[PDB]
Design a protein around this ligand. Sequence first.
Ligand SMILES: COCCC[C@H](NC(=O)c1cccn1C(=O)[C@H](N[C@H](O)N1CCOCC1)C(c1ccccc1)c1ccccc1)B(O)O
Lengths: 10, 27, 251
Amino acid sequence: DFEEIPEEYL
Amino acid sequence: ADCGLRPLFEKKSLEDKTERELLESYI
Amino acid sequence: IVEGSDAEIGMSPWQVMLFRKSPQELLCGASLISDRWVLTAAHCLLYPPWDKNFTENDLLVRIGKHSRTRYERNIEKISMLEKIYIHPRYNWRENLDRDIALMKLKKPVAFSDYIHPVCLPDRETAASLLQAGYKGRVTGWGNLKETKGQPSVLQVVNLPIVERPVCKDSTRIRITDNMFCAGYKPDEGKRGDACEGDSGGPFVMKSPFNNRWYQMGIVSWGEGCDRDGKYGFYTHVFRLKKWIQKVIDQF
Ligand SMILES: COCCC[C@H](NC(=O)c1cccn1C(=O)[C@H](N[C@H](O)N1CCOCC1)C(c1ccccc1)c1ccccc1)B(O)O
């Protein structure tokens, strides 16, 4: 349900 | 240090809507 | 949180969200105590009964948030963990005694209007404020009730510390001096409690002597949420501060 975080933090 | 002093509240002298309920309990 | 209300913007700027990288989900609450140290409940990181034992790279910490699910561009700061430290006598086997842990960040987080550290209580502030009847404030993005489901934004609720014999008599769990319980009694009318997902978040109090917010407890456990005759239990932060200081001083 979470909006995507900058994959960049991943 | 500056711990525990909110930029949006204590640092501007603004109170949140319920902090007074805490103060009123501290006797 | 059950029977709380939406938090105001920048109301709890030390609030931290413990976030699982994959699947991307909320794990627990936490709190910012300096620009590189975050405080949380040990059981949010290590809990063998449920095969929980997270390593640093499994997690992220999101600071300065309000909305539970939205990515708050230009407001929240996401940080990676350098190292996790769990109380050496954290009792996960029996009653979550000494349910506390520290998380050191890879890089210091920049303070802003929405990000700012809470103070840890000294002996005197604890003695003066941790008294039956005195109210603290609990915040979190945990469930809204025991069976709506989950909140849109950070929730807040003020709750009175409860007499130790009442805490004891409300449960079958062995209570220790490293815990305290809070909440209203059935006869007091008012309600509210922490719930699943709120664990690790802070129970704070505003000193009337110097007008600063202090973290007195950490959401630890309960039996259901907001049930009559049951109280939420919190880690007693002051009683475990010597360990906190030792970790921060050594590391
Ligand atoms: C005010 O409620 C706050 C809940 C906060 C959450 N804590 C937790 O969930 C906590 C971590 C490990 C089990 N735990 C619990 O809080 C346990 N609650 C149960 O899972 N409930 C109540 C009984 O019925 C089934 C469900 C709690 C417990 C108390 C009494 C009886 C059984 C369990 C407990 C306390 C110490 C050690 C082990 C278990 B949290 O992780 O977000």
